[PDB]
Amino acid sequence: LPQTVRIGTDTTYAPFSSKDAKGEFIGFDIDLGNEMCKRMQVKCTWVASDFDALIPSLKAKKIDAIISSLSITDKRQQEIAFSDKLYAADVKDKKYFGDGTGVGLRKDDTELKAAFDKALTELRQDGTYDKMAKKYFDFNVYGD
């Protein structure tokens, strides 16, 4: 695990990922990433990017992780690895509550994946997920 982790995200999807008047990264995606990074004891720099460029940037190693409401799909799994689910892929329907988004990561970076999964499991067990979800939403955004 390096000191640095660069996290790419598409900042056009409040309340998950967006930018405030002062330019800071804001949203549920940002709070999960920062909470995990703090538990992982690494430094995490947020990087703005168009969604279509996120995965190519991950393979080109411009960024080391993706957190951007990135839904876990068969096509994407063929090209990258995913962390455990962050929350449901589509909020507007229970049919997609079994689906899910996750942290996009390079397949060979198995050590960085487990680190994310470890912190994600630890922040959900101690209630940090719930308290941080209760800020934005009035429903079970994690889903199934």
The Cα–Cα gap between 61 and 134 comes to 34
- Phi and psi of 110, rounded to 5°? -60, -35
Instruction: Calculate the CA 88 to chain-centre distance.
Output: 12
Neighbours of 58 (CB within 10 A): 25
Instruction: Calculate the CA 8 to chain-centre distance.
Output: 9
CATH code of the domain occupying 4-133? 3.40.190.10
Spans of all domains in the chain: 4-133
